[PDB]
Paper text:
The membrane-proximal external region (MPER) of the HIV-1 envelope is a target for broadly neutralizing antibodies (bnAbs), and vaccine-elicited MPER-directed antibodies have recently been reported from a human clinical trial. We isolated four lineages of SIV MPER-directed nAbs from two SIV-infected macaques. The nAbs displayed low potency but up to 90% breadth on a 20-strain SIV panel. Crystal structures of representative nAbs in complex with SIV MPER peptides revealed the SIV antibodies to bind a helical epitope at the N-terminal (proximal) region of the MPER, defining a reproducible multi-donor class encompassing all four lineages.
The 6 mAbs from DBME also belonged to 2 clonal lineages, with the first being ITS111 and the second divided into ITS113 and ITS114 (manual/expert junction analysis was used to conclude that ITS113 and ITS114 are likely the same lineage), with all appearing to use the same putative germline gene sequences. ITS113 and ITS114 are most likely the same lineage but are assigned their own ITS code since there is enough uncertainty in the D gene assignment that it is possible that they are in fact two lineages. To investigate the structural basis for recognition of the SIV MPER epitope by ITS110, ITS111, and ITS114 antibodies, we determined the crystal structures of each antibody in complex with the SIV MPER peptide at resolutions of 3.6, 2.0, and 3.0 Å, respectively. The SIV MPER peptide, referred to as SIVmac239-MPER-3R, included residues 660–683 with three Arg residues at the C terminus to increase solubility. Density for each structure was clear for peptide residues 661–673; however, while some density for the C-terminal region of the peptides beyond residue 674 was observed in all three structures, it was not suitable for accurate modeling in the ITS110 and ITS111 structures. All three antibodies showed a similar mode of binding to the SIV MPER epitope, with their CDRH3, CDRH2, and CDRL3 loops forming a binding pocket that accommodates the MPER peptide. In all three structures, the MPER peptide adopted a helical conformation with a conserved cap through a hydrogen bond with N53 of the heavy chain breaking continuation of the helix. The helical region of the MPER is nestled into the binding pocket formed by the CDR loops, adjoining hydrophobic residues 99 and 100 of the heavy chain, which maintained a conserved loop position in the three structures. Notably, the binding pocket formed by the CDR loops of the ITS110, ITS111, and ITS114 antibodies accommodated a conformation of the SIV MPER peptide shared by several of these human nAbs, including DH1317.8 and DH1322.1. Overall, the crystal structures of the ITS110, ITS111, and ITS114 antibodies in complex with the SIV MPER peptide revealed a helical binding mode at the interface of heavy and light chains, reminiscent of human bnAbs recently isolated in a human clinical trial, although shifted in register.
Author numbering:
A (entry chain L): 1 to 111
B (entry chain H): 1 to 35, 35A, 36 to 52, 52A, 53 to 82, 82A, 82B, 82C, ...
C (entry chain C): 660 to 684
The structure:
């Protein structure tokens, strides 16, 4: 298998901030990397494929980059609906593996 | 517009066998696609379990579950199915059915997912 | 170990089963 990691597992920002998740892999998986957004409750939603190519219906603010071991998902301006869980997944070889997931929430919380 | 819909029972007994079926509502099962099943638990996490090719029928599973997982496809009914045995309650999770398009020589992302099916292994109600 | 490779995927471009049945007829 291929160890898929993701940093940070947690992150808090507010509307307007450029946030960035990073995704690491054991081996050089070229560009065979996809990003999914899962608003808890419903099922995952693909955002990026080939690391730097976004699906249909994906706002332009979302961005992806990377070509090997470490990749980046980059939201250029946060929004009320982006406060979801973000998974990165490699499909370079089987077994197909996902990252641990990265949390993204709002402000003014009981903590 | 491919649309996937899981089915099957969400009521299971420990150390047994579950059967789920994914009705495809946008493309033929016997196509140049790959029909996958995906497993999501809070602690065990989002895990790939299996896949089967619409044309070749080649099957592949996770090293952990290959020993206790089975793949199938019924094109006559335009569905594909999976069945996992020795169902320890730790396997209790959400099970999505997805698919991968493919290039000439390799697969692609999971472009389409089903709503997800909650199958729990226990002798009680919920 | 034996894994899912490109030959398998390239083979998924053809439905050999259906036409092998056409032969058995």
């Amino acid at each position: 298998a291929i160890q898929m990691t993701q940093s940070p597992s947690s992150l808090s920002a507010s509307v307007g901030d450029r946030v960035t998740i990073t995704c690491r892999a054991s081996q050089g998986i070229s560009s065979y990397l996809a990003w999914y957004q899962q608003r808890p409750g419903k099922a995952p939603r693909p955002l990026i494929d080939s690391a730097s190519t976004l699906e249909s219906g994906v706002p332009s603010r979302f961005s992806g980059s990377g070509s090997g071991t470490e990749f980046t998902l980059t939201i250029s301006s946060l929004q009320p609906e982006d406060f979801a869980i973000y998974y990165c997944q490699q499909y370079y070889s089987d077994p197909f593996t996902f990252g641990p997931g990265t949390e993204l929430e709002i402000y003014r919380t009981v903590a | 517009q491919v649309q996937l819909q899981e089915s099957g029972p969400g009521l299971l007994k420990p150390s047994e066998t579950l059967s789920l079926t994914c009705e495809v509502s946008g493309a033929s099962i016997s196509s140049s696609n790959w029909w996958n099943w995906i497993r999501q638990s809070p602690g065990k996490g989002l895990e790939w379990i299996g896949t089967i090719g619409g044309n070749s029928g080649k099957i592949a599973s996770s090293p952990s579950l290959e020993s206790r997982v089975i793949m199938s496809k019924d094109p006559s009914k335009n569905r594909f199915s999976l069945k996992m045995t020795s169902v320890t309650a730790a396997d209790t999770a959400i099970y999505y059915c997805t698919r991968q398009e493919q290039t000439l020589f390799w697969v692609k992302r999971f472009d389409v997912w089903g709503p997800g099916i909650l199958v729990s292994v226990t002798s009680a109600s919920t | 170990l034996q894994k899912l490779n490109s030959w398998d995927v390239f083979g998924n471009w053809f439905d050999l089963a259906s036409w092998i049945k056409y032969i058995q007829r």
